[PDB]
Design a protein around this ligand. Structure first.
Ligand SMILES: Nc1ncnc2c1ncn2[C@@H]1O[C@H](COP(=O)(O)OP(=O)(O)OP(=O)(O)O)[C@@H](O)[C@H]1O
Ligand SMILES: [Cl-]
Ligand SMILES: [Cl-]
Ligand SMILES: [K+]
Ligand SMILES: [K+]
Ligand SMILES: [K+]
Ligand SMILES: [Mg+2]
Length: 378
């Protein structure tokens, strides 16, 4: 092709390409190495990635995300029925299959989850093409290890619709392991633990690798735990702060809340590198500017329980895998949330000081591995 590797995440997608023995994680038109898994529909256009997320606050009903949560599932699924209650966009039943319903150019339209995902994949494909200066056709697309045959099929279909020849659908933890060369043959089998904390889901996977062959020993986690939840904690904290400082509640102003959330998400990323972050919002509510800051210590306290809770699925995974902590040869960090220092501390302490594989940006590790595998399969 060269063939590319694409990580189609619930919240962000990432694309990489293996060239000259090196993986290049490709930045998009805005210079971002990951792109929001968002698609928006308006009176005049269809927006994807950054363009879509940048307007979610003003067009909540027609801005779609979380397609990964619906992909390959049935409308009558308990989780689909539960998820629908929290999404601002509509989900309808088409002969037992879920479809997102939106308004586009003044008309009601509906798209299958794979159609929405194909739009995101198209964006990733174009991002790669802009970088390579060549047409990209072949690709390896990743999925969570617990995905079933239908969810994998629908994911492959999204690729095909986007014009990609999906060489293979591989598990996210396996892709992460490959990124670190943990698939190389060293004689005996090795047990690897993948700790994946993304924007919306937490996945712990224990893999056993031997002769380049992977075996998913066990999986654990929480499909509703991620960076988004950490943002929510900060949002509530600041809503309370604004109320104290202005005797005004912004909670019911959907937009004001979203703008605060975006500011919180950005502050959070900064706290992974510095011990303090500033938040300065203009015209947050009724023309009132909100200039404040938050410390890393404060951020950690607001999320203490959630952070500490990530260890439970780790213990469960080990138990189900019938392995003690000491039997894990490597710990791989995946997902943007694992960049949080407190999370790294908790996991390392749990593993009695064992070092964490974290040299590859956690939110890029999956695409990195997928790119390596795509090259191999080309
Ligand atoms: N430096 C950072 N510190 C803390 N959190 C970060 C940092 N960079 C990114 N994040 C968070 O990482 C999350 C996105 O992670 P990732 O890119 O792995 O998502 P994803 O694969 O779509 O995840 P999932 O499928 O779980 O939603 C967001 O919540 C984002 O705020
Ligand atoms: Cl772009
Ligand atoms: Cl601690
Ligand atoms: K991702
Ligand atoms: K995840
Ligand atoms: K997941
Ligand atoms: Mg992910």
């Amino acid at each position: 092709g060269p063939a590319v590797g694409i990580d189609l995440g619930t919240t962000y997608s990432c694309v990489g390409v293996f060239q000259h023995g090196k993986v290049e994680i490709i930045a998009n038109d805005q210079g971002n190495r990951t792109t929001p898994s968002y698609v928006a529909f308006t009176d005049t256009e269809r927006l994807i990635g950054d363009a879509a997320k940048n307007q979610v606050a003003m067009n909540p009903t027609n801005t779609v995300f979380d397609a990964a949560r619906l992909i390959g599932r049935r409308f009558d699924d308990a989780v689909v029925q539960s998820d629908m209650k929290h999404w601002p966009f509509m989900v309808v039943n088409d002969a037992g299959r879920p479809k997102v319903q939106v308004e586009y150019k003044g008309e009601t339209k509906s798209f299958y989850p794979e159609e929405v995902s194909s739009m995101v994949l198209t964006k990733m494909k174009e991002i790669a093409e802009a970088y390579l200066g060549k047409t990209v056709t072949n690709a390896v697309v990743t999925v969570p290890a617990y995905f079933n045959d239908s969810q994998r099929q629908a994911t492959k279909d999204a690729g095909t619709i986007a014009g990609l020849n999906v060489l293979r659908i591989i598990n996210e933890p396996t892709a992460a392991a490959i990124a670190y060369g943990l698939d190389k043959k060293v004689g005996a089998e090795r047990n690897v633990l993948i700790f994946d904390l993304g924007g919306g889901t937490f996945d712990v996977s224990i893999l056993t690798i031997e002769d380049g062959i992977f075996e998913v020993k066990s999986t654990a986690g929480d499909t509703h735990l991620g960076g988004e939840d950490f943002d929510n904690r900060m949002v509530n904290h600041f809503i309370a702060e604004f109320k104290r400082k202005h005797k005004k509640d912004i909670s019911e102003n959907k937009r004001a809340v979203r703008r605060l959330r975006t500011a919180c998400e950005r502050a959070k990323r900064t706290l992974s590198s510095s011990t303090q972050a500033s938040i300065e919002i203009d015209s947050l509510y009724e023309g009132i500017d909100f200039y404040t800051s938050i410390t890393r210590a404060r951020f950690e306290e607001l999320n203490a329980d959630l952070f500490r809770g990530t260890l439970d699925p780790v213990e469960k995974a080990l138990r189900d895998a019938k392995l003690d902590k000491s039997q894990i040869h490597d710990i791989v960090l995946v997902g943007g949330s694992t960049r949080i220092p407190k999370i790294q501390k908790l996991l390392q302490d749990f593993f009695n000081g064992k070092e964490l594989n974290k040299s590859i940006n956690p939110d890029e590790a999956v695409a990195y591995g997928a790119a390596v595998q795509a090259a191999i399969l080309s």
